[PDB]
Ligand binder design. Sequence first.
Ligand SMILES: N[C@@H](CC(=O)O)C(=O)O
Ligand code: NA
Ligand code: NA
Ligand code: NA
Length: 414
Amino acid sequence: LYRKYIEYPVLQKILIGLILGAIVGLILGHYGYAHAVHTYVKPFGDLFVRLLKMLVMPIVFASLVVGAASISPARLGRVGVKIVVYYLLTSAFAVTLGIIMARLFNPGAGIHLAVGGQQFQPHQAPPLVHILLDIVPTNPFGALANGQVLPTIFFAIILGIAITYLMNSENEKVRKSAETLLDAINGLAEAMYKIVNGVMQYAPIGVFALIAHVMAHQGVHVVGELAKVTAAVYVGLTLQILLVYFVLLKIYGIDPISFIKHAKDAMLTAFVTSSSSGTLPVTMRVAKEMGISEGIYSFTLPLGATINMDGTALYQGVATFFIANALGSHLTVGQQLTIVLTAVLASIGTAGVPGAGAIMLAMVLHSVGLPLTDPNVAAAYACILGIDAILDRGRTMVNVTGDLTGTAIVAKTE
Ligand SMILES: N[C@@H](CC(=O)O)C(=O)O
Ligand code: NA
Ligand code: NA
Ligand code: NA
């Protein structure tokens, strides 16, 4: 029944793997068979970790190039300024709210990951001058091949901006050559998102092996911590709607009660599909009967479907704290502010494809000194990606909801 396995829903598939993973570890580990799990069940979980790390490098480079080549055009108009400034402010405030939830609920506190029998000891910090000057790569190819992600981000952003200037050039041969290069890079990004969909089909098997191995060694309190981070994200998402969207709507005069009733179809549709790109046709229909002018929502909505992601920004702030707390490290004031800047940039480049927001988490992990090369970081990294399907549902609703409420405010003031 191979076809039956594929057609079965992914979220219900992961939940089955997690429940049986806990049961197997407890009963088998109680009878003094812990080494059997480590020798046999662990290798099936190591494949999931290695598969996740492969997708990190091609996705970051390709998505940033195409993302930077679309919002670069300065000429937008008068309705193209209010929507842009609103998008940046909402994304920045989402990260701050996520930090508050992480510092309040304190997820991941109690477990000490010691993969390889070595506690995570942070390396000595080089001088700030060296760190800032190391962002510029000496060899753009070398940064991509060696796995350095901070130089990769800088080169991708400038390359995308330069492509935009070429497409507006007067010469016909230069314009044709610039469009071909962008399409080739665009086709690489789209091909990688299909691999992400195929990797998550193996996720229920990978989650089963990971949970079973950790259940027989670090007891049961690990599962309790996973519940705290799941509750922390959804609590923060709820406060995002009531304390930001509802307040702004009431201030400008738009009735929140009428807003939710007229936009319920979009939110539930985005919830089940977990995609903000396939929900766009549904979003276009909803705004029509609301009263928005045809021109207003024909420009902001396509732009906001890939730029305005408040849920992803809140998710990345909470997830980073969970990994650091599990490792036993401490976040300084300067490092926390670095999250507020890196998470906003990472959310802009994130694509609407489901599951693409946990691949950009590596951008903020490296920015705070937690590389994926460290075995301890990688083990904890795959722990939060295992339950990503559960968290992917809620965050997609907030991303779509921000686009609708942003359009209404602009349309109110014309
Ligand atoms: N699924 C989200 C993207 C993400 O989770 O990163 C969306 O469609 O907006
Ligand atoms: Na935003
Ligand atoms: Na969005
Ligand atoms: Na995005």
